[PDB]
């Protein structure tokens, strides 16, 4: 199925 996308909240 679909692969979930995420991001680091701090940069």
């Amino acid at each position, epitope marked *: *199925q*679909q*692969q*979930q*996308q*995420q*991001q*680091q*909240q*701090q*940069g």
Partner: antibody
Amino acid sequence: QVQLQESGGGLVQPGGSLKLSCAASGFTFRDYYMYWVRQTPEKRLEWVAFISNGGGSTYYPDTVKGRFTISRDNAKNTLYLQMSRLKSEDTAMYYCARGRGYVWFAYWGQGTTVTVSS
Amino acid sequence: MQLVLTQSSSASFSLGASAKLTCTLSSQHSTYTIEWYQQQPLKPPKYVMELKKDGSHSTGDGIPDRFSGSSSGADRYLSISNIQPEDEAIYICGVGDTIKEQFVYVFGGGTKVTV
């Protein structure tokens, strides 16, 4: 200790506009992604805006895209939400939020209510 | 299909007992990591934990260890061992999908837990 405090809510009419503010502290504001999330009178939670750490990117769900505008002033440690062409459905408690790790809404403010009449 | 979250029915519990709250991801997204939020009356929602497909999780700050999570396919569970009056709240799950073309974030309709 991370703290976020919203303000700017009040009574308005459909088609009007108002701008909300979120004073942030207890952390380095310019390093984190910020968000606005709202809660309808029915108590349903709903994400409404995203802005990257330096203001480079913004995203909105279709319900407000084109009407709302999220922005930030990093020197003032303040997040904003310009609400235009208000709709009855915009009536809700508005929360300012900051993330942590991969979690979008790690920290929430106290909220400010926006009431659209008529 | 649309990214949706379906939460178990609202129910009451007895102190010391154990609770299991369910949040079901839409089949097409059964591998997704979700979040559990706890909102007490007239209080802002509060971050409880991040729950992955393998059931592994990390709780937020201020969350008693009597809070744990697990998975079962598309289901994501919030377990509350023992129970106290302070656990009385609305528990809502959410799931984000930072798709470059367009961000998405859905919340379930919440599960009201009485004690």
